[model samples]
Target chain A: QMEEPAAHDTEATATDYHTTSHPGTHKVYVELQELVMDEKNQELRWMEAARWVQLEENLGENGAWGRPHLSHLTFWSLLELRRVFTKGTVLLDLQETSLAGVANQLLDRFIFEDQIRPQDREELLRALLLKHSHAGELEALGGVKPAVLTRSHSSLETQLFCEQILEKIPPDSEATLVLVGRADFLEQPVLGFVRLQEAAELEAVELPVPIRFLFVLLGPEAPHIDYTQLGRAAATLMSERVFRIDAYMAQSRGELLHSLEGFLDCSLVLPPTDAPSEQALLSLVPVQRELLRRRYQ
Target chain B: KVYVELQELVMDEKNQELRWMEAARWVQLEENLGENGAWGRPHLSHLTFWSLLELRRVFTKGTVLLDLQETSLAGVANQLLDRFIFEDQIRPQDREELLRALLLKHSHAGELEALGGVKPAVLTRSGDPSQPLLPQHSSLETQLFCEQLEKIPPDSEATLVLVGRADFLEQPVLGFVRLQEAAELEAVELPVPIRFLFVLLGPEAPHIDYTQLGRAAATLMSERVFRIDAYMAQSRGELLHSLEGFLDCSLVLPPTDAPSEQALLSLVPVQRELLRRRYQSSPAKPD
Candidate 1:
């Protein structure tokens, strides 16, 4: 009779380094709903839900005024999420481990958990990381904590998680990830090495990885960087991974800030319940603890 | 001698001989017929023809002599008598009576043709089939006989002299003298037709050449020919004032008095019937 695979014997070996301790884990995620409800009960005591039964009361016949509900919800939720995740608030402890590792761990837990069965887990993780990078937090981390290769590890973690997630999804799915990062970090040999390490890890586990890898330099030096050289280096290190390097140096700091703020705001308000599956929550706790320790220190 | 006679005629104090010579010369040049022709002397013949024709209608038969010598108007009287007796076929005895009758008849006829409201006949008597009138005296003759008679020579006594009984001369002289005196009167008030005065100068001379004469006459009739003072009086009172009056008369001629309608419809030809049958036929509608 064929033996069943061990529960802990799977690709979980690669996530062994996530069992570290960290301060500021509380800052990684916050109870935004509890905060809003508390505020409502305190200052707005006289204004009951009944008093404002419909926020869009006079929306009119065509419902044109209410058309922004979905976009508004998305925007506010993502903004809140950004605030929760950045500076070691929730998910990965971005101060402790390499930026590549933390990013990969968070992606694996939140986006690629088996029970989640997301149509596009890789797309979701990619998009989340892109939001963080475009907020200038990646650049800010690059600037403020220039020695913190821990935050840079977050990018590699994200790339690996995306590769594993893409394995199960259909290639034709209209899904995309807007993964953003520093121009210098994106071109570094460390990111290419991490990608190679991820591919090797997936091979060791005997799982087919479907990651089409790429680096987009969302930094001041992005415009001047040679994307072709970076792409070639990345391809050589991670032979199975196809990489595309883009430079968006023309985008302003304010624009980047606005985009990140919008994303975190949306994510925190909506509190994407679809994010943490049973396996993801279980896996993310330890990895997130490690990321927080590395990123904040 | 001929030259001397001419000089004598020219120098004559009364200018009677010179006038006769000039008239006789004009008659020869105009008639184109020489002396001894059927007409005798041209000037005498023509004057006589005019006078006799006028008289025969009044007194058809009579003994009358036109005594030319008494008047001392030798050329005119002679021409008048000769024209009446010879060319006009009036008997010598009837000449004086013919002249007297013509003078009286002319005065009466002139009055009748003018204020009396009688239509004047242009033709006098029909021509004789046996003896046709000379071409020079024909109805179609354009030149005035008097103008031709004025061209005569004083030396040609036969041409310039008139010998006739006194009766014809007496009536013409008496009637004309009275008429001249009447014309000079301050308030004689002769009732004459405007047209009578217009034709009084006689039919214009054939030799005058109307085309050339008309051009010459246009210049004399131009506003430039009139005295400025006389023109100014008429301009202020009559010409300018009449122009200022609002005379709203029709520029077109008045309608004809004929009974038939003169509209274009009366003159149109009948419409031709269409020979080809129309491919599509439609019902006629009632008015």
Candidate 2:
């Protein structure tokens, strides 16, 4: 559990942070049901009748968003399960904490678990954690199978290691393999397309089924965060093949999401008529118009 | 005489022949280029070719009125806005508004682009009893001004500088925008379509090097681009100091200072006539 901030931190009762009505409120990720504002037709979506959801509370804090980042990984290997033999896997990269975890775990449990035969034990998914530095003993935990070390990691390593798991699926069948990479490893300064922006070595990845690669990158302003390109010829078959979601894109509201509180705790509000702050506001004017462009189109 | 003319052009009065109209245009250029209250003294003699090419891109759409004394930064910004909007390049019908978008768009060689609230104001007398922009030479004032640069892409990622006649500093100029007053402010997010970076030159030699103070400003804010990047030259044979606010690459035109010093010139020129010959012979890099 985290310690509380001092009283002065929360003292800005007059600030719009209280009711959640300020500059960035609209960006909060409210649930899909709350989105269907009409009264009579309020109904559940397809996933409730079809999929399963398991929250981390039942599993403990698990460090998905914390120091160790144990739960902070993707089940990319599940795409190779016996059922789909199906074309592609949608690997979610940009970790939006709860939502992303919930979405993919649902993909794994309902989609993969339900398919296993009753005679066999409900086997847990095996994963690899690239162990290095001060990540604690997280690799010793249940799902973690391979604990390796590396000074640098990128598409090259993802391409090489994925080959080991890629060999497991019988030809066209798919699987979802997961791994937790060190944040320090992912922090480097380069931009543009992944492999192409890299030193072009076609020695890449090609999984059995096609893939829906979902990458989670939190820093749109950060130039050097890494992205993995599985060099698989199998990825070509999906409808919207290449999917990228970053911190800026995942703006949905969470129930306990204290983003507003966070902002107000450290935000510098405009004094009645400070020219500098007003000028900052004007600067966003262009960006605002840009948002409206999609609607016009 | 040619050397003296070269030295004169290079030294004190960069262009004794500077027309008020051109001077005013340059003022508009400087005032509008950076954020509000932020100004850099450009070493025009050091302005580069590739750099001039970029400024020319801005000039294609920019037109200067002959009655330079009457030109306002707002007016020039409006003209640029009209030209861009008409060409379907940029939008929203106001200079500052259009520029407001541009300021937040991209970081020039950075994570986030420079955001500036640029408004032209006549320079106010320093250390005044009641001045709008803070006085020069004080560390507190430099920080306040430099921090305004941080006011947009990150916070404001923006800055401002009010441009007006040099004589106006003798008294507060009429019609100049008073920036100390604009900060109480709103927004929609926009997709960045274009990235812009530039500098405009005036023929008149500026007096103050504001570079030292600019360095202090940048250091205080801990930011690049917000640092004082421009400086005026000194005539009468004294070597002008280079700006150290943000970048280290200084612009160079054939060395015009005392023959003893030659650091500013990268492609050194032996004489003024030879310098003029290059401009004449150096066919402008293809359009």
Candidate 3:
């Protein structure tokens, strides 16, 4: 016969988050807020020019433009990204700058380009479709489905194009792809069309592809392209190929635009020599380096 | 033994303390006044007399002359005076009286005569008088007289007048002066102080008990009022031969109810024992 279990007279309760632990929890939250604020500030400089460009194109000539709005947007988006990563309170300041920069780039390239011939426009759209399809095929070869690869995309055409290419690639070669999105695009709520491929054939494969998404803010104004929604859609469509999402906000409008140019050209531009190490980057217009120097030093 | 003799003499009803005075007077006459009924040979130079007078003043009343007499009276007086007199008022006169009384008892007339006289005026002035005819009253005249007196041969008889009261003349002065001069001339010649002789003689007396007599004599001499002696002869009983040899006598006392031996034995325990033991353990065979 089993002996009776020994009596454990004193019971100690495990600590849970409550008022007794609030101070410590609040201190940690405040520290996190500071880190989020510092990160958004750093992104603001790079987000500056992009936001200005987007404001000029999409928000029209009458819109208020400059550092304040950019700072707000970048800080908002950075806060949101921090929340996504850590699952805490999302600050809206980071999105303000990021959305503006990406929106500006979209308006300048697509929405404001009204003088183009219909054939050039078609070529442009077709090229975008083909690029999406190539990206899907690469993901499929790594054993990822087009829907999973393009789940975070905002456009249906872009999603469908990706699915077509995914069916053509060998399943044994399927792999996840890392896509870095602009903050404005990732913030859009709607999933892209890539989720519906050749409805029948794409469903049969059901390949698992994991995609890693990084969203960065590089401009001002809302993008008509909805890249934020598109990014989410792509991530969901390419579930098998999507592993995580990382988002960053620019600290300045001018800095963000410059970063967009660097991204498109696949080049990195260094901040001026006078900028502080923590503030010096291609997409970040350092807060008068002297100011940051004084604050941090 | 001497102390016992003194004690017994003191206890005797006839003599008592008065015996010492009588003895002193006798010593004075014999040693100073002399048989000639005059002062003894003035051997003490003028300077010697003056020196002794000065020396006497340094001691307390009786102490000075008692020191000079060389008699036990000085010691006895010191003890008695210390007992009876107030510490502050012990005058030279008191000491003189004490010595006079003590010596009178212990000495004879000749002894008294031998103790000579001092001239009071010579001592007081310490200088000669103005009168050319009678300078003897002056210290200078006495000093000259003393000098002239010393030149005479010891055997020669001469006379000199000391101007003073007869009572003072009969005291200790002349004998003391002669002794002072003799003592001074012996070592180193010095000018003698005229009155200092009386003090000198007392201090230089010749006898076992002379310390007392000398001190008493010195005390009397310092007063400058009394005369004192210069030379003293022994008692008739003490003499081996009298000038007239027909009379053969002893200085030893005649046997009395208290014989010397018996008297000696009747003393303190220690003394009695000592005498008893001496008699008992005789080295000489008894006849």
Candidate 4:
């Protein structure tokens, strides 16, 4: 559930807060349909839709748009992320150690929910495993690289014990991978988020960082709702430090959904007038720039 | 440099009014325009940020009226119309027709039911308010503009920046007013307490989509940075400065023009990632 905004906010803040209510995925679809119907001109409707897409897709710099203090976030991604938990599978503290083992456990849930048919299991598993190989789809979005927690004996013991007790931990001890691909047999996209009980070394591949989180998104080859955009949406959220913290802190589905709710409510709108500014683009390190080209371009 | 350039380009010193032609000409003549040229689909594209600045040139310091104390729609209209006339943007004789064109006429109950809802009005090239202004074969631009017009909230919590063309005007004119207080007016459904209003009128230009320009103005107004700057602005100079800051942030080049299967995916820039890191390590972390 969303919380009430703080008092003594600016009127601009008050105005944005008033209509910033979260919409269902259906609502997004309906509004998109209305936009098409309302604008009869082939080019104008597209430009109109393009602006609407920018509204849903873009992000802004921290403090660029005034905030309760955070850089702006993606609204459509928040809603879709919420759906991944509510309608799809959420396996918190997943104990599976291998990629295949985890895929089986997550796939079974999808079959049970009828999100995927039982007969389609093998192909989905194969696709998931292939994407999970050293290709490293969402590895860039795994926040910081995990490393040794070397400290005083007492400090080390406390963190070690904390790790033992909790299957989920913060960025220091965790790495995440978001797998996205397509399957023509499927009518709709099936999304899943799995938080590992402990970091695991893969059998066939060795990524730079140990893996702890897996977010799987696969859909039919649809023109309107491309899985690539959804993948980037997921990547954008995963790379967000606040989102990663919340992913670790969430105890249940409601809390995970609430995390997204807070994101939309607090996030500022990214004006659709243009792409990320040159300053915004130039700030990226060379390697990061390469990663963006592969993942977002 | 930006301020000085805009002054010469946006203000027509000879006419003592805000004129877009010279500014548009300036943008048209710029070197190294590069990928910032008209973008999107070839047929359904938008002007580059430079050209967009020229289109917005009509809204100069002289044209901007701030902290107005008008309490009613009539008062706002009278005050703005008088300003338009004083600036020599609009002729005194054309005031009555401009007012009728500006306001959306509410239909009677029977007419409303027959038409289904209130259809948006249009100013024809003849300067006549066309009955059933939306003809079956109206230009696609007009139809599209009407759709964008529908997005303007019909209540007090929104800003209104309506654009149209008329035979009475020889050139385009733009005036913006930020009411000191929000005022909800009688028979006015284009947002009740219209705190901000940008009235734009130009002579007919078949190639130009006047309504689309209205959407652009409204879109700029909607920017949180621009909105706050507009609300706090004390002088006309401040508004231009605000616009300059916004223009500086616009992308000079688009990655490409044609739509690929993956074209719609947002290009995540490093600056955003850098900002996220700064946000996390800042004095106040949301966690």
Clashes of each: 80, 78, 199, 3
**Poorest 10 consecutive residues of model 1 chain B by lDDT?**
B1-10
The candidate, 2 or 4, that scores higher on DockQ is: 4
Model 3 chain B worst lDDT window (10 residues): B1-10
- All candidates' chain B TM-scores are 0.17, 0.24, 0.19, 0.60
Model 3, B1-287: lDDT tens digits are 00001000111223222222111111111123222233433221111112222223222232212223222334434543443234333334444543443233333333333444211111111122111122221222122222232332343211111111111111322221221122221111122222122221121211112223232333233211122121232222211111111011000011111112222222222222222332332232211
lDDT of 4 at B265: 25
Task: Tell me the tens digit of each residue's lDDT in model 1 across B169-279.
Answer: 212110100011111111111221000000000122222221122211111111111112112332223322211110110010101111122221111110000001110
lDDT of 2 at A122: 22
Question: Over the stretch B93-119, how does candidate 4's per-residue lDDT look in tens digits?
Answer: 878877765554322222322332322
Which candidate number has the best DockQ?
4
The CAPRI class of candidate 4 is incorrect
True-structure RMSD, every candidate: 59.0, 24.9, 66.5, 23.6
Q: Which one wins by TM-score: 1 or 4?
A: 4
Tens digits of per-residue lDDT, candidate 3, A1-297, equal: 687443342315412211231111000000000001012122111111111110110111112221211101111122223223231111212112222232233333332322222333343222222222221232233322111112122222222121222333333332222122232222232111110100111221122321111122111124223333323222222221111111112222233333322221211111012112222221122112211222222
Q: Give candidate 3's error at residue A137 in angstroms.
A: 99
Q: Which regions of candidate 1 fall more than 4 Å away from where they truly are?
A: A1-100, A111-115, A131-297, B1-287
What DockQ would candidate 3 receive versus the native complex?
A: 0.00
Candidate 2 segments whose C-alpha is farther than 4 A from its true place:
A1-106, A109-179, A182-223, A226-253, A256-297, B1-75, B83-287
For candidate 4, write residues A37-117 as lDDT tens digits: 111221111001000111222111110111111112232334445555567667777788888899999998787667887
Instruction: Look at candidate 4 and give me any clashing residue pairs.
Output: B155-B191, B155-B192, B156-B193
